Swiss-Prot record, chain B:
Places the protein is found: Cell membrane; Cell projection, Axon; Cell projection, Dendrite
Gene: Kirrel3
UniProt name for this protein: Kin of IRRE-like protein 3
Post-translational modifications: Undergoes proteolysis by a metalloprotease and gives rise to a soluble form.
Effect of gene knockout: Mice are viable and their size is normal. Mice show defects of the accessory olfactory system characterized by disorganization of the glomerular layer of the posterior accessory olfactory bulb and formation of fewer, larger glomeruli. Mice display a loss of male-male aggression in a resident-intruder assay. Mice display moderate hyperactivity in a familiar, but not novel, environment and defective novel object recognition with normal performances in Morris water maze spatial learning and memory, contextual fear conditioning and extinction, and pattern separation tests.
Span of the entire protein shown here: 47 to 146 of 778
Length: 102, 101
């Protein structure tokens, strides 16, 4: 089987516009590339999501954490997100973020 | 999108054992390009070192990021797309049909 497994995977969430949200992703003992995918499109490579001011990879990389923080949820963030590892060739379960607008 | 594909991959039928190239080009784009196979990214840019069977080829000066499958096998029958991170564009998906003797 895949040498690697996820220790944490992102979960579906309902959030309010303007609220931060952290989607969890962790892979123990894994020192390769991790990508976050939003509706099929990669947001960046590793911690470099510099094309998206609204998205930040956080968590303790020493703990194998690659959490996606959406700093201020807006309706455009209502999407399906997944975490995947290139060298490990594994994909997390997909997580739907529901954004509700005040 | 300030950027667009000059070439995108097309569906292709190939026999097991033969190489096959999937075209992808984005003129004047100096950001990241990824190849995606059945929803999974194969590498970043020219670094597809996790897969000895897949090489990115083509003239990078002309913005080409062609995927060369060196020796098609049954496990390579899949849907492929190329996509650009900073440009935030995805190509059309290309289905590679691999036929076996
Ligand atoms: Na960012
Ligand atoms: Na390779």
């Amino acid at each position: 089987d895949p040498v690697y497994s996820f220790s944490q995977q992102p979960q579906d969430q309902v959030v309010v516009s303007g609220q931060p949200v952290t989607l969890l992703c962790a892979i123990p003992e894994y020192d390769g590339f991790v990508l976050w995918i939003k509706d099929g499109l990669a947001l960046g490579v590793g911690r470099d999501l510099s094309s998206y001011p609204q998205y930040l990879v956080v968590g303790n990389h020493l703990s194998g954490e690659h959490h996606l923080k959406i700093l201020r949820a807006e309706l455009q963030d209502d999407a399906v997100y997944e975490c995947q590892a290139i060298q490990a060739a594994i994909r997390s379960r997909p997580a739907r973020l529901t954004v509700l607008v005040p």
